[PDB]
Design an enzyme around this catalytic site. Structure first.
Site, PDB file in Angstrom:
ATOM      1  N   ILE A  13      73.681  28.232  17.877  1.00 21.27           N
ATOM      2  CA  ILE A  13      74.414  27.768  18.946  1.00 21.27           C
ATOM      3  C   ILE A  13      75.659  26.777  18.916  1.00 21.27           C
ATOM      4  O   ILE A  13      76.636  27.148  19.257  1.00 21.27           O
ATOM      5  CB  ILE A  13      73.845  27.499  20.282  1.00 21.27           C
ATOM      6  CG1 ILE A  13      72.968  26.232  20.386  1.00 21.27           C
ATOM      7  CG2 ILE A  13      73.069  28.594  20.908  1.00 21.27           C
ATOM      8  CD1 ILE A  13      71.917  25.591  21.437  1.00 21.27           C
ATOM      9  N   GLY A  14      75.215  25.618  17.669  1.00 21.47           N
ATOM     10  CA  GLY A  14      76.257  24.710  17.657  1.00 21.47           C
ATOM     11  C   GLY A  14      76.866  24.765  16.327  1.00 21.47           C
ATOM     12  O   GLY A  14      76.665  25.719  15.379  1.00 21.47           O
ATOM     13  N   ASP A 119      50.075  18.380  59.909  1.00 24.26           N
ATOM     14  CA  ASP A 119      48.672  17.421  59.600  1.00 24.26           C
ATOM     15  C   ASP A 119      49.055  16.289  58.428  1.00 24.26           C
ATOM     16  O   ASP A 119      48.771  16.618  57.421  1.00 24.26           O
ATOM     17  CB  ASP A 119      47.616  18.282  59.337  1.00 24.26           C
ATOM     18  CG  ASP A 119      46.510  17.700  59.118  1.00 24.26           C
ATOM     19  OD1 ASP A 119      45.397  18.074  58.166  1.00 24.26           O
ATOM     20  OD2 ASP A 119      45.810  16.678  59.878  1.00 24.26           O
TER      21      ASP A 119
HETATM   22  C1  LIG Z   1      69.278  32.969  27.520  1.00 26.78           C
HETATM   23  N1  LIG Z   1      70.229  33.160  26.259  1.00 26.78           N
HETATM   24  C2  LIG Z   1      69.694  34.177  25.098  1.00 26.78           C
HETATM   25  C3  LIG Z   1      71.424  32.936  26.551  1.00 26.78           C
HETATM   26  C4  LIG Z   1      72.413  32.118  26.128  1.00 26.78           C
HETATM   27  C5  LIG Z   1      72.082  31.495  24.924  1.00 26.78           C
HETATM   28  C6  LIG Z   1      73.085  30.516  24.218  1.00 26.78           C
HETATM   29  C7  LIG Z   1      73.801  29.948  25.058  1.00 26.78           C
HETATM   30  C8  LIG Z   1      74.880  28.671  24.427  1.00 26.78           C
HETATM   31  C9  LIG Z   1      76.126  28.499  25.341  1.00 26.78           C
HETATM   32  C10 LIG Z   1      75.001  27.379  25.106  1.00 26.78           C
HETATM   33  C11 LIG Z   1      74.916  26.216  24.495  1.00 26.78           C
HETATM   34  O1  LIG Z   1      75.837  26.097  23.506  1.00 26.78           O
HETATM   35  N2  LIG Z   1      74.138  25.300  24.778  1.00 26.78           N
HETATM   36  C12 LIG Z   1      74.136  23.847  24.154  1.00 26.78           C
HETATM   37  N3  LIG Z   1      73.176  22.961  24.526  1.00 26.78           N
HETATM   38  C13 LIG Z   1      73.011  21.889  24.017  1.00 26.78           C
HETATM   39  C14 LIG Z   1      72.156  20.776  24.191  1.00 26.78           C
HETATM   40  C15 LIG Z   1      72.440  19.712  23.296  1.00 26.78           C
HETATM   41  C16 LIG Z   1      73.201  19.488  22.098  1.00 26.78           C
HETATM   42  C17 LIG Z   1      73.230  18.397  21.435  1.00 26.78           C
HETATM   43  C18 LIG Z   1      73.391  17.089  22.007  1.00 26.78           C
HETATM   44  C19 LIG Z   1      73.462  16.136  21.153  1.00 26.78           C
HETATM   45  C20 LIG Z   1      73.466  16.044  19.771  1.00 26.78           C
HETATM   46  N4  LIG Z   1      73.295  17.423  19.273  1.00 26.78           N
HETATM   47  C21 LIG Z   1      73.291  18.491  20.073  1.00 26.78           C
HETATM   48  C22 LIG Z   1      73.913  20.735  22.146  1.00 26.78           C
HETATM   49  C23 LIG Z   1      73.866  21.797  22.569  1.00 26.78           C
HETATM   50  S1  LIG Z   1      74.802  23.467  22.702  1.00 26.78           S
HETATM   51  C24 LIG Z   1      74.207  30.578  26.374  1.00 26.78           C
HETATM   52  C25 LIG Z   1      73.527  31.598  26.944  1.00 26.78           C
END
Ligand SMILES: CN(C)Cc1ccc([C@H]2C[C@@H]2C(=O)Nc2nc3ccc(-c4cccnc4)cc3s2)cc1
Ligand SMILES: CN(C)Cc1ccc([C@H]2C[C@@H]2C(=O)Nc2nc3ccc(-c4cccnc4)cc3s2)cc1
Lengths: 237, 240
Positions: A13-14, A119
């Site tokens: 994701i990142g 109650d």
């Molecule tokens: C259900 N699923 C299959 C759908 C879906 C998956 C992935 C996403 C991606 C858009 C979301 C995303 O990028 N989320 C993130 N959450 C975090 C939380 C913490 C950190 C974080 C915080 C501090 C240090 N390093 C990382 C990075 C992310 S990217 C959306 C829908």
């Protein structure tokens, strides 16, 4: 706090390198075991929407037959009624007023949401993390004149029960109207008798209990009014 | 909602009857992969003490070797920067102000906790459940978000974070536009030292632009604190 490997990786994701994953953890819950299958899914969903930090949260229901159940948030110290009784003579008046404030916070939310508990008593309240009290489970000794005489429930009838709950708290779990029959409690309240003032309850606190115990519900203070008053006593101390 | 049999019964506690049980639920998490083991168990515990609805919570750490990793609360809509760009022309001023308010709550808590983010920007903030904004990447251990004492003497404080916030507000209200788009680090430093500030975005009001300018006062002592900014931003939100 450390994790072993109850972590499941799914996808990236990142862009450092981050992953979407699941964390399958064992959370302590309280399970209540128990016609109209469709209605109970809706009833639970309605209760699930009643979210507040001072109300015991219902996580869900299990309908896959056998003893059917309701899943609630686990309260580490059990019910308030038992917590008070087993700690009698070790409480500071500050702790007790705090307990009443927690109950009133939850009740002020229920009043706003238009939900009548019906109650409210120390047996229906539970003790959680660092002595936090949460309201749960939504009886003549906790009933108001309109309730025991006519079953005329309202937030003001829940206000009366809160007056009794406050007394249960400041008396460190004593039984209200100790050796009194259902008919005798009705007679006593009708004849004007009110519960005695516990030593741990100040004159201002006992005044609040007596206001909750007024004959006519319209003469009683609403939970929003009670919340502001108890919050002030708590902070001014 | 319904649960099947991800329930494990343990003991009777109630007498209808109640049981103590465990519930194994699949919770969506964000795993960041990576200074002795001891030190990083303490640092993870300190970051876990910083709990707020407007900061991305660290659930814990994994130290069983292979790639070591940090486990955070997952944010379903990703980072603010990308969320602003991919939804440009579809935002109401109220939504954008609502986003600034979220960051302000998290930052006012960090300010009171005596924690300095050091790198506050839209790229670091994350979008969650019903457009909620949460601050992230604060205690994990550029000139466009940097205050003059930061680009000159590296004087980091909660007041320097307020400058970054004023720029973050601009990013939000300009729906993710790049601040000082075609300006070199030398150009930015010079321009800000002469008194030039970022222009008012279309969707940002007059009152909002005053707020942004107060975040951009030369002296940190002239900038408003996050506690002051919160009360002011909350007041605008409750009225208009
Ligand atoms: C259900 N699923 C299959 C759908 C879906 C998956 C992935 C996403 C991606 C858009 C979301 C995303 O990028 N989320 C993130 N959450 C975090 C939380 C913490 C950190 C974080 C915080 C501090 C240090 N390093 C990382 C990075 C992310 S990217 C959306 C829908
Ligand atoms: C290791 N540790 C888990 C041992 C332990 C065992 C038993 C208890 C007992 C005192 C605690 C208890 O009774 N907790 C309860 N929590 C809830 C939460 C919700 C409901 C509930 C809510 C609504 C309807 N029915 C039940 C009942 C309880 S009893 C504490 C520790």
């Amino acid at each position: 706090v450390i994790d072993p490997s109850e972590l499941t990786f799914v996808q990236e994701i990142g862009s450092g390198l981050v992953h979407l994953g699941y964390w399958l953890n064992k959370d302590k819950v309280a399970i209540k075991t128990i016609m109209s299958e469709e209605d109970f899914i809706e009833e639970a969903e309605v209760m699930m929407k009643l979210s507040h930090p001072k109300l015991v949260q219902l996580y869900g229901v299990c309908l896959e037959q056998a003893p059917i159940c309701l899943v609630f948030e686990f309260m580490e110290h059990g019910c308030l009624s038992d917590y008070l009784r087993t700690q009698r003579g070790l409480f500071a008046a500050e702790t007790l007023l705090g307990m009443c404030l927690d109950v009133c916070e939850g009740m002020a939310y229920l009043e706003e949401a238009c939900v009548i508990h019906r109650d409210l008593a120390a047996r229906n309240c539970l003790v959680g993390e660092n002595q936090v009290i949460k309201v749960s489970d939504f009886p003549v000794k906790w009933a108001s004149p309109e309730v025991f005489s006519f079953s005329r429930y309202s937030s003001k009838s829940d206000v009366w029960s809160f007056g009794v709950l406050m007394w249960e708290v400041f008396s460190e779990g004593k039984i209200p109207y100790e050796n009194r029959s259902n008919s005798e409690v009705v007679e006593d309240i009708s004849t004007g008798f009110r519960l005695y003032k516990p030593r741990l309850a100040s004159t201002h606190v006992y005044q609040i209990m007596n206001h909750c115990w007024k004959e006519r519900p319209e003469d009683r203070p609403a939970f929003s009014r009670l919340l502001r008053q108890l919050a002030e006593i708590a902070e001014s101390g």
